[PDB]
Amino acid sequence: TQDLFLPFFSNVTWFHVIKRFDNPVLPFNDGVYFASIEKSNIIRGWIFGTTLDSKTQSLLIVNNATNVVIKVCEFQFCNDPFLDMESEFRVYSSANNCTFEYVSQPFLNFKNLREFVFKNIDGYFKIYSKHTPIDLPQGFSALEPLVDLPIGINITRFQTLLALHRSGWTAGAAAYYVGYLQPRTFLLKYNENGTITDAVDCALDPLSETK
Amino acid sequence: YSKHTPIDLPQGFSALEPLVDLPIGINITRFQTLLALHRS
Amino acid sequence: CTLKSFTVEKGIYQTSNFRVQPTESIVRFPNITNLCPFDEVFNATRFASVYAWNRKRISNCVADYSVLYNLAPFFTFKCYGVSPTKLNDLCFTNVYADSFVIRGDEVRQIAPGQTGNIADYNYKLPDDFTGCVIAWNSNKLDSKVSGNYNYLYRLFRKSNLKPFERDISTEIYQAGNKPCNGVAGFNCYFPLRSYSFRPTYGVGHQPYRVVVLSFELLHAPATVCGPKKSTNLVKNKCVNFNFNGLKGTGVLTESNKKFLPFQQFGRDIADTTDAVRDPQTLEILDITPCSFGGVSVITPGTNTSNQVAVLYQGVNCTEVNVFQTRAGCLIGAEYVNNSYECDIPIGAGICASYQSIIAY
Amino acid sequence: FVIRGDEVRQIAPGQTGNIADYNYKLPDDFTGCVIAWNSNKLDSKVSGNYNYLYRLFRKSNLKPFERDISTEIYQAGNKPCNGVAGFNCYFPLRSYSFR
Amino acid sequence: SAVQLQASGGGFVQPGGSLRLSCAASGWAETFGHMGWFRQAPGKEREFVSAIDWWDTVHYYADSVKGRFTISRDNSKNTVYLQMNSLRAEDTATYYCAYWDMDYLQNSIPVDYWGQGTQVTVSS
Amino acid sequence: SAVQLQASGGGFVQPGGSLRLSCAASGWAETFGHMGWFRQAPGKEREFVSAIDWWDTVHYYADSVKGRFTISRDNSKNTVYLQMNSLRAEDTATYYCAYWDMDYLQNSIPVDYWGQGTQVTVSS
Amino acid sequence: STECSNLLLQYGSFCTQLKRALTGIAVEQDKNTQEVFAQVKQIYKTPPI
Amino acid sequence: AQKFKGLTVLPPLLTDEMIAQYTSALLAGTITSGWTFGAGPA
Amino acid sequence: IDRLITGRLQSLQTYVTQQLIRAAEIRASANLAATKMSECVLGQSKRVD
Amino acid sequence: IDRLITGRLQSLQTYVTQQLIRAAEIRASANLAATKMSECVLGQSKRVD
Ligand SMILES: *[C@@H]1O[C@H](CO)[C@@H](O)[C@H](O)[C@H]1NC(C)=O
Ligand SMILES: *[C@@H]1O[C@H](CO)[C@@H](O)[C@H](O)[C@H]1NC(C)=O
Ligand SMILES: *[C@@H]1O[C@H](CO)[C@@H](O)[C@H](O)[C@H]1NC(C)=O
Ligand SMILES: *[C@@H]1O[C@H](CO)[C@@H](O)[C@H](O)[C@H]1NC(C)=O
Ligand SMILES: *[C@@H]1O[C@H](CO)[C@@H](O)[C@H](O)[C@H]1NC(C)=O
Ligand SMILES: *[C@@H]1O[C@H](CO)[C@@H](O)[C@H](O)[C@H]1NC(C)=O
Ligand SMILES: *[C@@H]1O[C@H](CO)[C@@H](O)[C@H](O)[C@H]1NC(C)=O
């Protein structure tokens, strides 16, 4: 089948948090593959939007120690929207207009990895996820759909949230990588249990084309 | 439709020709026949 | 019939399929539909003032239209541009409800192109407004024997109220050249006035609850649609069924070994829907189309005799002098343990001949 | 026959609606022609025209090219109407307002 | 529009007597349509008798019955009433409760619904 | 089908004013379809302005003339009428009434018939 | 579906052609083996020694 | 395999047992009787 | 539905033609095999190779 | 009428292809007959059967 996918052996951008505190702006393009090797669980939530201000409505997703909350509310993002035991929450200063609300159960050496893929198309914010315990891993892992959202806006940018522990202050050594999605053709090998066991790219190298 | 041939049911064969068409349209379900009785 | 002749010579023939299996049609739909909060606006006992009407937004639910029919002994309902009956089947991506209490004599002022104190100072209805208006008497609950004064309506304003506008300013209206400066008196009257709702008063002065409904069509997935009726579910015996639009016909058994919970359908090598999960009970049940036809017939030439024998292709001899062969099931012929020369081939080293009809 | 402006869209194979279910139904294989023209000058009066009637309620739809003239009281509930109008007891045919 | 009309009253009386008729409306309609009463005799046509609005503002009586029939609207139970007085023999007929669904009744011609026949007989 | 369209109205006007156009149809067509107006600026391309169904149920207007032009229909003459105000300089152009012979309108690309050009000029 | 057969019936008599061809192929296939093998009408048996 | 979507796979008339019998008979004839059995009595 | 019928029937006819050609080729091979069995087995042949 | 034209054209092609295949088979049979006439008549053949 041909669809949006991440090309194999592609360059994924790496951001390391440790006196390193990196929360830059990453363009959305068409779809996003968001991976995170997690230790001490310092990455809390996702931030999405187009203008990233109090101007145009955005999408908010948080996953605290209690549950997950999805809101569509206009916020106010400062220079360093993050969290600070994590009881100090300095991310947004205002919340004015809300459109959609939802709440669900919480989603949760190298020991943990959280994988997500977001696809905003046809006015739907499809989110697929994966959670497999353990640099980047080398092993085939099927990635399962988790939710669909009828939002119907036009995300063009996104951010990330962090929960810095205050001691001096040290940031946990969790890692996250970002990759982009392109339309291409893949071949998938279903099995008896209807599970994706292997998949070959059809545009990588001549051997792949022959396969 | 109709047919007519001079003579239990006869063990034979004979086709039927179209006699009359009525250009009406009503509800039509269970019917019953009529009879004629000679005076006595 | 298949051979297009009145005489058929000796030999096996692969006849076509005939007869009729009528069956019937059924439809299923997801169990339970999330109802929109209609009673949260209507069945609510208390209402806001006409100049401070309640505005509510409805999204992400189904809108059943049967409860509204039972709302009052006599209520006046009218939509602009949409007929009453054909409102249920429409799909809307937004709807807004405005509710308040007004005087009965001024209810007709709640209409496009209407004027009056309310239509200019309390709520203006746009001329091109599409949507619905519902009104019904509320003297029983919006009036008391001591002259309830809770509800109020605006009386004075500098400009006529715009369509879809809310004015709740309580500043003293200046009716003269001299300023009011927050002091009541000459040329300075309170813009807010309250009716006198009493049970003994006339129906014109009796309060009436009025709710307007506006349909908003934004470029977004729809959220306001009529409920879907689910029929019964015939099982086991081969019937036709229609799940969410897709068709099927035949028996219903399990095809589940590790069927993924989120998965809905299941296709064979033909990319044709075979396994389907019922929205109710969420169990899995495949199709296996029934109404098989195309049996084979072995017969000598009619010029000779008239007896025939039937051969069902690849069917067990209990799913219909009965004989069982590797090729299929044979009916009408008797097996002989003797041996002869092959006359009419059948398959797997079985031949039939007419001596009655025998197979060996 | 006389019909209410909009309705014209119903007189066509495969169409539904009151006229196309209880009053006049066309077969799917119909061949022929249909002529339709406004007659507000003649069939409508400022004095009120009410000699034109159309059936509103019927238990079952009509077969193509079918005519129903029964005037029995429609039953909408379990209780019989006994030829008397009332709750769940409405006259099957309504009238046509032309102005 | 779906309006159900119920008629109450009627019977046998004597000339010069008094009587009370009533009609009740249930269901939903386009607007606050007015309410009226008609009278049909055996072998004759229906005759306009009385017409009142939904708020007791406009009273309309036929010329032959001007100043004699009376119509009123209640305040709390939605039922219209028709007070009748000093009956004569010509009043023996079947009355019907007529509804018309519009705000202003230019004429009694546009009728959408009728009512159950109430027999009123006046005789010695 | 054989449909003839007769157009009337047009002339010289002042900016911000109102003027008069009306189109009548005669003959016989396949069905009761939509009817609209088409604008041709000098040196430019021909673009639609609006489209109204025959039964005056749903109306379609261009984004450039919304809230400023309107179209209605006669009740005893079978002639479509349209009104406008707040006319600006760009409105000086040639207008044509057109008949669309299908029940449901999808887009303005397929046009069946065209009427005689009515030139309207606005200036000071 | 049955009503599709209604259009199939009026669409022509191709089905007969295809069925006849695919049965001729089958009978020819069955005859080939018998021709290539059944060339002796006696069944001889090897001696035990 | 056996996805019976209106397509049949008929079985051959001669089972492999009969074919093996034919080959065995031919071998016996060509071993114990030279080639005369192909042109008359063996 | 007529277009669907046309496409499906065209595919069926194409498959039938392919089967016909393959069956003809197999029949030619079977005839050669029968000749070899009749000559090279049931006797001794002086034909070279 | 274009659909009728195309249908009749396909009906012609089916027949033409079938005739071509049958002609090829008959040509093969005629070649075999010619060989048999040349050998088993104009001379004596030592080929078995
Ligand atoms: C919220 O956003 C709206 C428009 O998006 C704006 O009018 C309002 O002032 C904002 N309020 C705050 C507190 O940011
Ligand atoms: C969404 O935003 C982008 C950038 O602001 C804009 O170019 C695009 O047209 C918008 N799309 C929608 C669906 O409004
Ligand atoms: C005939 O009458 C039955 C009821 O007796 C009705 O259901 C059916 O539709 C009618 N059919 C015809 C021929 O109109
Ligand atoms: C629907 O509710 C649950 C969830 O599907 C199911 O178990 C139950 O049998 C259904 N009952 C109804 C109300 O149809
Ligand atoms: C076949 O038909 C002929 C002609 O009537 C008849 O004489 C003969 O007996 C028949 N033979 C068979 C096969 O019964
Ligand atoms: C046919 O069915 C019977 C029981 O219904 C079963 O015992 C038998 O094994 C079946 N035949 C085959 C070939 O499976
Ligand atoms: C086969 O049939 C013969 C009679 O012809 C009988 O003697 C024998 O017992 C039968 N054998 C079996 C296994 O049925």
Numbering used by the authors:
A (entry chain C): 51 to 68, 77 to 142, 153 to 176, 185 to 210, 215 to 247, 257 to 300
B (entry chain B): 204 to 210, 215 to 247
C (entry chain B): 301 to 620, 641 to 675, 691 to 695
D (entry chain A): 400 to 498
E (entry chain D), F (entry chain E): 1 to 124
G (entry chain C): 746 to 794
H (entry chain C): 852 to 893
I (entry chain C), J (entry chain B): 993 to 1041
According to the publication:
S protein in complex with Nb4‐30t, we also observed a “2‐RBD up/1‐RBD down” conformation of S protein with two copies of Nb4s at 3.6 Å resolution, with one copy of Nb4 on the “down” RBD and the other Nb4 on one of the “up” RBDs. The Nb4 unit binding to the RBD in down position appears to be more stable than those in up positions, likely because of additional van der Waals contacts formed between the Nb4 in down position and one of the two other RBDs in up positions (detailed contacts remain unclear due to low local resolution).
The SARS‐CoV‐2 spike (S) protein is not only responsible for host cell entry but also the primary antigen for antibody generation in the human body elicited by vaccine or infection. Structural analysis of Omicron S protein or RBD in complex with Nb4 suggests that Nb4 has a unique and critical epitope for the Omicrons that is evolutionarily conserved. Based on our structural analysis, in vitro biochemical assays, virus titration and challenge assays, combined with relatively conserved binding epitopes on the S protein surfaces, we conclude that Nb4 and its multivalent forms are broad‐spectrum Nbs for neutralizing SARS‐CoV‐2 VOCs, in particular Omicron strains.
